[PDB]
Amino acid sequence: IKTYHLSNLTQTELLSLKSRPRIDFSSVFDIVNPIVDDVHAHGDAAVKQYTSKFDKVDLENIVELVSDLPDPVLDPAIKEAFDVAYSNIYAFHAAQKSPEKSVENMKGVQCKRVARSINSVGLYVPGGTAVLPSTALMLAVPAQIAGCKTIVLANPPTRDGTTCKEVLYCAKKAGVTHLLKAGGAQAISAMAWGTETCPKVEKIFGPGNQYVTAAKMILQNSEAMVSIDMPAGPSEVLVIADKHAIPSHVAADLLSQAEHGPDSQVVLVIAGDGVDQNAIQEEVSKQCQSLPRGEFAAKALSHSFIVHARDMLEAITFSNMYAPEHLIINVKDAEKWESFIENAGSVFLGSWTPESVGDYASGTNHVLPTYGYARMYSGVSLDSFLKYITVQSLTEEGLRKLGPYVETMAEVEGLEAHKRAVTLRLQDIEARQV
Amino acid sequence: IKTYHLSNLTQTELLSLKSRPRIDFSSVFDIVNPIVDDVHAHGDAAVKQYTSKFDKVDLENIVELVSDLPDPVLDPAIKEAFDVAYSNIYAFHAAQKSPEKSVENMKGVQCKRVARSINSVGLYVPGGTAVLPSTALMLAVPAQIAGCKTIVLANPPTRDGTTCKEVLYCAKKAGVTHLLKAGGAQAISAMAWGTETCPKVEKIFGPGNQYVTAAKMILQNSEAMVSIDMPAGPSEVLVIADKHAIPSHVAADLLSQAEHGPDSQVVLVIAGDGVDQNAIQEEVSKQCQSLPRGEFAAKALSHSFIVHARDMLEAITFSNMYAPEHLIINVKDAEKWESFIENAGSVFLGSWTPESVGDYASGTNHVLPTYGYARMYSGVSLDSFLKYITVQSLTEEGLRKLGPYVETMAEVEGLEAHKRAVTLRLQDIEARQV
Ligand SMILES: [Zn+2]
Ligand SMILES: [Zn+2]
16 A cells, blocks of 8 residues: 655665565475475375375376377367467567577688577476466467477366366467476476476476475576576566556556465556546455455555656656566557666556556567566576577688687686697698698 | 497486586585675675685775776787687677567567666686686676676786786776676675675676585575576586597697696597597697696596497487587588587587687687586577567557457456456447547
């Protein structure tokens, strides 16, 4: 409910706004380490125990090959909607391919950067009661485009043990190879180390909850030889609204984020004068009462806050400091403010572009950096699933011309074998002129 | 000396060749962790103390604004060599800028991905017994191209408290804003947390020794809010050689990697037949005893190994498994095999392209993934210094076309607030034209 005016604040007060409520992950590591170690040591049996324990389901086989599962049949309207998403997500991400053009800054010194897919990747889509086929498209489409050979999707089952069929449809469309019917730390460990039946993966994506996230943090510093997309905290939106924003559409934007759960973070920034803060707030109350996830949204909004900025430059400056997962800019001429944005996972410009268009189908990626990590991490993209290999090839003339400079730098550095690798080659070359 | 043949080996045995020796991080962690904490709590005073103990230097001004440092004067061959290097590294990295073309897969649905620099960055360049201006260019040039506002270059001082003069030259050329005259874990903490005079940075780059590396690793899972380039181990080279390779050149390539240190890892893969392995081992021995760092190279070569492959495909396949920091391909028609390489930091094709060319001046980046982390990490590049923000903007028509698909997918996921944010908007649009 809290309201702040940027003119009222000291440098110390600013800073407490920039930082999210502390999550002590050390605490969460203590809970997660035994689970990670158990799966590491005892494999599928251990995974089955934790799945029985936490998801209250007992599994025969925790992994299946997706190409052996039947094509599920969906309501045609539902199917077409996910085909549209797929199509837009596919096109946005395919357009991120780098051309691989060679640089020749001196004659005969040809260098280039080429993309190779990460061979094996693991994707975490939360499950049980959550039905998250959208996240499945977000992780698997760019994997598919990148060409990854093994694609493990981890998706904890419903209370009976049934795979969410929309997720499965999405997984089949994006070439997921393996479906791992587990969640939690236990699923992260199984992909990081591999098991009797779950392939070992080289990189793991999707933030899951704070327990998934902790295991990812832990396993990236372990011997498992696994990298992750990014660390994480709760989901967030920051909305900037000016007097041209419709109060009820602003309210709906706040609740759209709030309904993700009690820990979602909402920030309303009011840029300029003439905005009816009251109407927005009342409109939030009215809309919240009919939401089936209204209890979640209300718990979330109990630690939301409002910020008054006297102008749009101040609003954006505050948003840059904050570094929001999602940024909504509902102000006149929103597009013009783009070159002022420095830190945000994803940006929604104007009045017709709610967060859920990006959550589902605009084509951008919704697995975005939270907690302030947009300061140095990007949302998942095609490049998240590639390594770039640098290549250089010299001709004789190139080495003739570049070698001496190399000789010089190696001497300066005290590295004489580095020098001789070149000199010995130059001797051979000069020896073959008569 | 030690040799293997790919035909003679079991699965069990290949997998042993793939994996590097384990490093005891536990002992390193015991050293590093209280250093980090101490710098976090006590700032520059804590840093001064550690510099005094390990580097044996007592210095009051540990952070220097590079602007008001006088240009060093170095001999002119040396200036000219680093200038060529600067030029090739610049050109190579500048060619990596993405176009930011908008995607419009459905009329009025406009999406894009824009580059924004990481606002502050830290660059680690080893000192004391090392002199590493090449690394200064490798880290600093793409930061400068990326437009990072604060660039902190950590480099421990020489015994009199001065900065290594070649390193300072490269920092001024590449636009480093601050110089932190400290090394080791204490340097890393100072950049990760900020001190009284050292700016806090968002990302830290550069291998260092195992103390630096452990500090980077701890700090990436800490509350400091800092990412890292990549984890790391000892540097490595894998050289693929066929019968057309000149044995002495092959030997000088191995020594070039080996002279880095006793842990530097070296692998020779002999592909096909007609290769004088003896001439190569003889040549390694003559060359090794005529080197200043010959004792370092010999210790490294004691844990080197050879692999015989019946053909080049099998050689490449083995190399793809091993996933070397550096790969040299000295075979016939080396360029043609490019498409078969899946895992390698940087590649050197043909007879005239030694590792040291890439270490110094080809333009590629020498800060590369070791220990098999080439399976999922790239070398440092322009992208390492950027976040890519995704942007979407819808017209009214765009939302009229895409919104209904989104309402449905929101229904499926049980996320009514996500649906309503679209519906209120579609209602407003409908109200207006009637
Ligand atoms: Zn959402
Ligand atoms: Zn080197």
